[PDB]
Amino acid sequence: VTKSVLFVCLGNICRAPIAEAVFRKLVTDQNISDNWVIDSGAVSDWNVGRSPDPRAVSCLRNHGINTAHKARQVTKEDFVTFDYILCMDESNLRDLNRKSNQVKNCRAKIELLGSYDPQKQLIIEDPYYGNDADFETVYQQCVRCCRAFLEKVR
């Protein structure tokens, strides 16, 4: 059956754009592309409509990955429509758990993307104030976690 994943972070301009692209390439190579609906969302609304941070685009490009990401915000309905909601850090998780209360038929499994990391680096740090190295790290964690996530949910 078709499954759906929603990657969530604070501004949806750095981490989520990277995780979504990484996951998209994984399922495309493995050829299971059409069994998954992939999307991204932000906890906040400041960057709604915005394209990814240029440092996130460069990093992805260094790995032969392209993307036409347009930031949108998470809504109450995402909890009832998506199978999985994978977020970046502690606050994301907290914010999400809190919002999934105003919703009666919540059915999305809200989890930290890093909980799937075999190297157990649970938290995926916001790189907005860092350098290109911090973006490569985020990329490295997403590969680790996404690859592990897929060989576990199908």
Read off the amino acid at residue 133: A
Backbone angles phi, psi at 11, to 5 degrees: -100, -10
CA 105/CA 81 separation, integer angstroms: 10
126 among known catalytic residues: yes
Tokens of 20: 């979504």
The sign of the torsion formed by the CA atoms of 122, 127, 128, 130 equals: positive
Q: Give Cβ neighbours of residue 31 (< 8 Å, ≥ 6 apart).
A: none
CA 150/CA 68 separation, integer angstroms: 23
The fold of 1-154 is Rossmann fold (3.40.50)
134 among known catalytic residues: no
Contact 47, 8 (CB under 8 A): no
Cα 72 → chain centroid? 13
Which of the following is catalytic: 53, 78, 117, 126?
Answer: 126
Technique used: X-ray
Terminal alpha carbon distance of the chain: 10
CA 79/CA 144 separation, integer angstroms: 25
Strand partners, 38: 5
154 among known catalytic residues: no
Domain spans in the chain, listed from the N-terminal domain onward: 1-154
CA 82/CA 109 separation, integer angstroms: 8
Tokens of 45: 């609304």
